[PDB]
Design a protein around this ligand. Sequence first.
Ligand SMILES: [Zn+2]
Ligand SMILES: [Zn+2]
Ligand SMILES: [Zn+2]
Ligand SMILES: [Zn+2]
Length: 115
Amino acid sequence: RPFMCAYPGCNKRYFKLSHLQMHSRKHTGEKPYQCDFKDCERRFSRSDQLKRHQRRHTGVKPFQCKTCQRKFSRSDHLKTHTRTHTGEKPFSCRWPSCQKKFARSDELVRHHNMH
DNA sequence: CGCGGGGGCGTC
DNA sequence: CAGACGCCCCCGCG
Ligand SMILES: [Zn+2]
Ligand SMILES: [Zn+2]
Ligand SMILES: [Zn+2]
Ligand SMILES: [Zn+2]
């Protein structure tokens, strides 16, 4: 049993390899991490998750707009904002000829919902 | 109404 | 524990 499971607090061996691959599946949805913040007791399954959530407090804005020089807490958000300039709109309204385009997927969804 | 910003989740 | 990229979803605001 060289092998061991990575989940926190549940350290233990496993003779074979596949005999362990299957174990982890147990930890499938546990929330090992939490936020060491005042009254903000929120648990996160993944690590990058918590890391990110941190910024809500920290204030950090790790990403910056090459154009507006504006900083954002998330890359996906910046990614979008980048269209503020590019003027890209990959989402066309699927209704009869109401050929309106939107930069964000959901931005469209709300359009439809208004039709 | 366009877009900021936070959640959750699949994935290499 | 795999950090990091990418989306959908949903809400709030000027
Ligand atoms: Zn385990
Ligand atoms: Zn917190
Ligand atoms: Zn910009
Ligand atoms: Zn339309």
